[PDB]
Design an enzyme around this catalytic site. Sequence first.
Site, PDB file in Angstrom:
ATOM      1  N   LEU A 239       0.796  -1.204   0.028  1.00  0.00           N
ATOM      2  CA  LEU A 239      -0.044   0.033   0.112  1.00  0.00           C
ATOM      3  C   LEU A 239       0.813   1.301  -0.026  1.00  0.00           C
ATOM      4  N   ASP A 240       0.419   2.231  -0.723  1.00  0.00           N
ATOM      5  CA  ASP A 240       1.162   3.529  -1.004  1.00  0.00           C
ATOM      6  C   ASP A 240       0.607   4.525   0.063  1.00  0.00           C
TER       7      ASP A 240
END
Lengths: 118, 97, 72, 457, 604, 169, 85, 166
Positions: free
Chosen positions: G39-40
């Site tokens: 996840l960014d």
Amino acid sequence: XXXXXXXXXXXXXXXXXXXXXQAERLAIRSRLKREYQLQYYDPSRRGVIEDPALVRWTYARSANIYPNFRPNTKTSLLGALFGIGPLVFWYYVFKTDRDRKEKLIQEGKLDRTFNISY
Amino acid sequence: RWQEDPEPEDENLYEKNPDSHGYDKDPAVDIWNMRVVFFFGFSIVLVLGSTFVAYLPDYRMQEWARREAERLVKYREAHGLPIMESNCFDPSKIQLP
Amino acid sequence: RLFIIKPSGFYDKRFLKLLRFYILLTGIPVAIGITLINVXXXXXXXXXXXXXXXXXXXXXXXXXXXXXXXXX
Amino acid sequence: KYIIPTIMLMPLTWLSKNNMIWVNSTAHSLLISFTSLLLMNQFGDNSLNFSLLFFSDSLSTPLLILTMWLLPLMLMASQHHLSKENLTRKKLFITMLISLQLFLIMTFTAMELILFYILFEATLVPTLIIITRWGNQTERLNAGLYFLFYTLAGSLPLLVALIYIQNTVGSLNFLMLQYWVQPVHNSWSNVFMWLACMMAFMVKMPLYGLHLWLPKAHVEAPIAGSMVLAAVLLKLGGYGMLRITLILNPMTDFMAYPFIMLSLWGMIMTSSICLRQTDLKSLIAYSSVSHMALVIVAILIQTPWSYMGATALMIAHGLTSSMLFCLANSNYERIHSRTMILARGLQTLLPLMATWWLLASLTNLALPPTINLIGELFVVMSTFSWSNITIILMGVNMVITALYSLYMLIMTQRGKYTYHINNISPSFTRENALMSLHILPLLLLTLNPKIILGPLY
Amino acid sequence: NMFSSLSLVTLLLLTMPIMMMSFNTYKPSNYPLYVKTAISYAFITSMIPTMMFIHSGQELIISNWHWLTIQTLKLSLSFKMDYFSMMFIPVALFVTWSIMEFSMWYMYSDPNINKFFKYLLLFLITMLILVTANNLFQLFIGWEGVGIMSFLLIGWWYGRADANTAALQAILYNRIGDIGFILAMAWFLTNLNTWDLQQIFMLNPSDSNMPLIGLALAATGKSAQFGLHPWLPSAMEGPTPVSALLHSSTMVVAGIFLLIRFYPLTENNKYIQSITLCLGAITTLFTAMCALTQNDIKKIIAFSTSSQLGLMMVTIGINQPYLAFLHICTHAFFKAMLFMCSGSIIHSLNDEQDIRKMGGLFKAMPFTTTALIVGSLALTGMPFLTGFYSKDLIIEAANTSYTNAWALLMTLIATSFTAIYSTRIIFFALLGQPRFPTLVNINENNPLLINSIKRLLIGSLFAGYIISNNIPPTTIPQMTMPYYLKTTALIVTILGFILALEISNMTKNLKYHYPSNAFKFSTLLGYFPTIMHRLAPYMNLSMSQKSASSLLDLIWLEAILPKTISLAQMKASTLVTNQKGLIKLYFLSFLITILISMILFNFH
Amino acid sequence: XXXXXXXXXXXXXXXXXXXXXXXXXXXXXXXXXXXXXXXXXXXXXXXXXXXXXXXXXXXXXXXXXXXXXXXXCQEKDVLCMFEAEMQWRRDYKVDQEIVNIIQERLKACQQREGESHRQNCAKELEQFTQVVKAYQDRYXXXXXXXXXXXXXXXXXXXXXXXXXXXXXX
Amino acid sequence: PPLTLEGIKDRVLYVLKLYDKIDPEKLSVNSHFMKDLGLDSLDQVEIIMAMEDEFGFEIPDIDAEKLMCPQEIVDYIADKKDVYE
Amino acid sequence: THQQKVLRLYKRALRHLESWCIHRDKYRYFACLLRARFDEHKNEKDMVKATQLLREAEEEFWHGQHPQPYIFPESPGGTSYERYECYKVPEWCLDDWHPSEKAMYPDYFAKREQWKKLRRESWEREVXXXXXXXXXXXXXXXXXXXXXXXXXXXXXXXXXXXXXXX
């Protein structure tokens, strides 16, 4: 009062002076909250808390009148023209209505025949 | 220094050592006062007093004037031309100037 | 089932019951007050003969209870 | 009939035992208040004199009944206060109310001006002792000294005025004798004679100028909140303006013209301040200025319609503002501050008292015909016959009469009070019984307002 | 004989739950059911005197409770049962008959379920007095009484923020409307000694001061209109059946109702005829514009009330009181459905009040969606859907007059504008793909809902048959122009719906259309929160704080006191601290005192 | 009765010829409610009137007539002016409710006719305009608060104005 | 309708499984989205916005940084809306 | 912090996007276009360029700032039920209930009495633990968590406990 652009997030910088500015504000905020926290979470109290902020807020309007108003200069005198002035303004309004009404009763009747109350 | 000036105590009846009361201390005095004679004036002045006020004793000729006016209307219409008021309470006054 | 919200209720509901108890206590002569119009005569309008202007009550109209208060 | 049984209340409290006192003072006052609605109501076309001129009859004053209504009502809320202190301190400040009621009965009944004067100023002395002592907050003296040096500064010119009338024109006495009074020729010597008669009833009946006497007395609480109602009794206690203007100077109305306008601005500006004010007792203190200012406007017009609303407003205000002060007192003995923002919460904490808070606030507005609508409406109708421009200013006042009482509601109708933990018991029987004894007489005056509004009605 | 007797029964039936409100007999859980059964038989007892009115009979009664005997006046609790008053009673009672039984379903299992019904009963009685008002003092009991009970209804939910001001503004703008009303009261007494409404029909004086600065100024407080109308979107903050009554039949009529009842005054005076249409011209578009941009289920219908009220103000200006109440009697059936059936959606899909999030399809909830089709189309000019018997009669009559031409052209845009916001309930929310308000949302039809909407459906379709045929009319307007006047009422609804369908579907499909940043919208709220919620409360409080309190009330009016205290103390200090003892100094002054009496004074 | 004028007689008669259907719904309900709760109410009213038996007539109305004119005895005297002012205040209270009867005479015309309004009656319209105009000049209106001592001045002001106009013409 | 402790955990897991960008087999519930799951920084705020739309719409901006793990986010949403007795 | 200001702007951007679009499929399409704008500048880290980007991010957004956005059902501020249907009653007025009425439902009173005794006894121990935290002024930002596990209750006891429920 509002400007051309509404302030919400406009004109803000990180820098170094603003970084220490937030540290100053959060320090007092936590200082005044902890004295509330120790007084809130105890069953032995039962009673409304005073707090120095709200007492001084009520004292600001009810008192601190005669220690103030010592440099009147011109701003206080302009308030009197907006103070007792409107009474002089309405003094010529009602008087012109009286000269209109009193003349009509004696000559050229304007009051209706149906009128009887007051 | 205050010495003796610092003396304050929070007092509230609420329910503690009172059960359910209005007057401070003594359960026997409270019931006989706050529920009996407090409500006796509530029963006499408000309920038995409502019969008076303005209803019953005529009150400044309000009802009397109605019957008095009606008999004067029918009499003056049958005989006279002017109805009630025209030149009332003044007849043959001693000049003007 | 839930514990629900909390109000004093006991102090509130007792006041209305204590109020009504003293309204109904003096509500008995109110009930008699209706029957006083029923049993006793209410009002009559007639031209009186020259003998007496006032007897017990000087001027009695509508209700008979007006004459009873006029005596005292 | 009224004096002597009222005087016999003085030895009652002193002779009775220490545990009782409050039971005897409340019960015996209620039975005497019953007889006021029994005997005083009887009148003809012109109200006939009672007896000798010690105390006389009522012509246009059923305002005595209101004093008899507050005769036990002032003793109810003063139970929570004074209870901590000594028995002798209790017995004194119950008898000071009885002494107040003794002089107050004497003011309204006695058809005089000379002896009326030494009863009008005589009511100031018992109230002075009550206001200066038992003050919860400080600056008691900045209200106690203000209570005399405003009233006595305006009323002492009555000695040079009233005696001047009787020395030239027969005697003042009965007022029923006063047909001797001749119309004023309008001279500069007669200018200050009219002003001296007015100024006494220009201070107690609050204008915009010299109005500061009133709010100082209300904010600095005498005892709890029920002695504040005695100061309300003094607003209506200055009813001599109904008697002086009608009889002593009927031709004089040219000098009334600026004094109507001074009271007309004591309606917009007095309502503006009563919006941002912090003290809850002050919000009733400035609302009491406007309601009594409506009477001041009505009297100086001198039309037969205005008096019908003026006399009604004296009774309307005396049972509604006093009702509002009892609500302020019911929060003052629980939170221990006059602050509006701090004490916030109805229905969630105060369930049944909130409905009393509604009915008291709605009476400041124009409700379905109780007494407040009846009292105000005649004044608005009388002002239009006086001058057509009035309702443009009077209508603006009707907007802020909502803001007089809805702002009191909004700042109490909020489910908060996070800082507060006290006020467990909402009403201890008598607390709501006070509120019922204030509103139920107004509800009974819906059916018969003929008894209330009666100057030749 | 029975006409006078049965008229009081309808009034007494509504006061019976108030008699049982003060304890009397115990009713647990059955107290909301008791109100439903009370109004049910109140409707039947109101239907009989209307049947007598179609035949023959008109009676106006006084209860002999004349509380005022003050100066040539009699003021009893009077009840007028004449035409406009008589017909409105069973119409308004049937509207309440559903809404009060809807409150069994909505706001269920609440601790304050009893109190909710309590204030709604007083809200019903106060209006019924105003409808049956035969005295001007009797008129105030209703006109203020409805406006004073709205505080407890709009501010019913105990709101910590915003909800209290919503109820405050409803009285605040009404009290600015009171300025005219009490001026209309005071003028009435000073000019006419009678004071009651029975006078003005005979010996009527031609004056512009009475209805303009009076009834027209009272028409801005109640009914909202153009003068002051920001209280309508705020009124939606309260519960859904409460907002239904204050906008369909009850609170809405009170402003226009005065103007219908005093109809001989409007006919004689020509200066009132112009201003009634001049105010009515701005109401038609400005309120209808706000219905386009604003996207809240409750708030869309809230602004649609005032747009329909634009046509209600035209009927006063055209001098036709007969056609005036006919629109409102059908308007009572138009928006009793539309406010409530939309409220059924809000309760079902959790608690959503936005059209953007709501996506209730026609197949999903068939009972509520079908009511939305009937309700919305009835407002537009439809040949038999109760619209032709109310809306279309106003437009046709407006064409043939000596009155303003620009006002006539402005109303024609509004009649086509009705189709835009009505489709914004259908095409935007009901029709198309579901917007999905929440994951797993429970929506089901209740037995209480079925026996309420179906009973309203008969009333919303057969209103054009019963009301129009029974009431005797005066002067028929439809005669001239087959396409310019007669067809123009129906053609505007057809061209309006076609223009709305093209405008909505272009944004609905879009794909790569891209919404533009810059737009010429003076439409979001009409910019009234910028002046009446931002500027006007600030100006009244700045003149209260910068002036008044900080100048007059505490400083300058108090400034008379130091002139008699501080200057007195200054003069006092010059007679106490003066002379530092010494017998020498006091005897030095005694030398002068004799010289004053001998030389400076003429006496010896 | 007697004092009130009212209309002579109302017609009010139904023919009912067009459309049978269910005879008349208004007439059938009127006949039903006449026996249900109207005849029962009439029986209870008659039973209470019969139960009274003994009834007191009493004086009802008081006399009090003339007692000398107010505009005859003057020069400020307590023994004379007091009873004279009482007579004026009695008449003023009577005159208030005389207007009310004439006011209700116009109210009766508006209720009965409705549609006609100003086209008919005319007699009640003329009776209202004659009394009220005379009431404005003689009793209060412009004479402020009610006082009999000031009432003589209002009559004298009208007498002086009429004499000034008569001398010119 | 009332929400259960087992029901709230199942509802949050169903929305997380249909994320497309995140692997359904790699992460279940106990694993953190900050380090373990892909996840960014911008993706974390987008995942919270989708979860709020499904349940009771309540999400603070200041409290968004404190919630990162799906197990912690399910507990925080249940506590604020008052779930499971 | 710079990272939090981007997160707050992105959270507002998606929630303000639903006001303009009608359907959910167009909402998903326009969200992908917004992500492409941010990701181009996200890779490069600068103290001058990124701060100028954040100040310019307010522009264009402010041009389309007021179409009356969807402010959710039960949400702080905005419109539609912010405090409504959530009035309830605080725990301060729980002990106010007098006998006879307090006797009804004894399980609710007995469990509360046991909980109140636990809160009163732990109040003295929590008061020493609150001043045990190193600051030597008063406090810093947030309240400190308890280190001891045997006694439990981390300073505040009536903070999480006693709350409003619909």
